[PDB]
Amino acid sequence: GATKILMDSTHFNEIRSIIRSRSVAWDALARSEELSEIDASTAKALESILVKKVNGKTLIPLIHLLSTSDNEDCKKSVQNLIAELLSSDKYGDDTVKFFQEDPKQLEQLFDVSLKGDFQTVLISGFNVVSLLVQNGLHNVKLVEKLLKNNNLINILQNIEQMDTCYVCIRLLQELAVIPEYRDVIWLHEKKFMPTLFKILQRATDHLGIQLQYHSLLLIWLLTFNPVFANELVQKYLSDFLDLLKLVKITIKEKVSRLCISIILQCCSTRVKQHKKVIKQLLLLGNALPTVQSLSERKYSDEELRQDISNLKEILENEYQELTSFDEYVAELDSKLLCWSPPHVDNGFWSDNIDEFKKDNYKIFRQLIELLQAKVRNGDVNAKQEKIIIQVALNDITHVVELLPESIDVLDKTGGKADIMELLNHSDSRVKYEALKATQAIIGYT
């Protein structure tokens, strides 16, 4: 009736079909006086009224067999019929109203949920998770109770059973659907982190990717809160750097855009001092090539591709500055250079090496434009201009030495002639750098 989820995955469907297929007679229990005869009669009648009237009458009656259950099959069928009537199209919101009128009515129901065998800890928990974040009924009690559940602890932590793991996980995400109710889920998140890292490791190697997808979905939903996302990458760097590779290698773009948007949320400006995250991730995680290949890749969703370009741009924004290549860009834009080991250090030369030529050697063109402008006009060699043009000569020299295809431009830009005309200068240093660049053009012929 009102917000009935978890009808998507076929697992919950096969589970609901397997549990509700059990054979138990409420009339036989009424005849054997195993429980309340009135409640058993209402149950036997409701069974035939379901499988094929309003609720609230048998609500109190089912509680008799709920709070007190002599048989496990009785309670199992009770909770099964409970969750089935909750998601029932016939009853729906009416049933929800029975939970909405009295908040303490489902409290004991939640107290009787998640106990004993793995079969019985599923359905009662399904109805409980369904009610906890249902419509108007919200309690920190159900969260605190479910978080400390040791019966559900092994259910969610089961790496053997994928069905139980997926049921408990999807229920975890569904209960975290309200971020305000996710605070406790975020505090106890240490236990959910392990199964997540497990889904990530199993990811690195039918519908089996749906579990990892819902898990990554819970991760991104928890990253929605900048506080929980503040300790996100600040906790596990190991499980964090395994995102982009497995997401790119992931066929479906669900988990791909999930890891992309979650990691983007991790390095986001919205997170305090999130620069260190993207820094180490692009450093020890080699996210440069991953972002390059992902940006060169394709995506079906618009949001996935847009967030891809945005995250790649965000990474490339502070990655270029380490080793600041923009630092020289300021000197070029201001047309004033200085003494710095920018073209001197080989590492700095290797860092901005990839940014040297973008579109038709745009950066190289911007590099030769300054010297050419200091050549055809002006061209007065004293103090500043001399050391600046000399530094530009040595830098453009290291550049042409690095880029073998960078020669073809120097001839068409009039740079070969200005470099050769720089052979004879007033300063021995300018002539030395210019002769060095001359031998550099002479290096490959």
Partner: protein
Amino acid sequence: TPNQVNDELNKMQAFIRKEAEEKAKEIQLKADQEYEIEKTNIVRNETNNID
């Protein structure tokens, strides 16, 4: 057989329903984050002007 055909059709509608569900969810989350963010920005500008 045709049974698997209609089942495949229902499966297709199911896949589209799942894609649409995850999309709507992502829309709601993005709505929460964007609402908080925009409110924060407006609050920042207002706090600056007020100060």
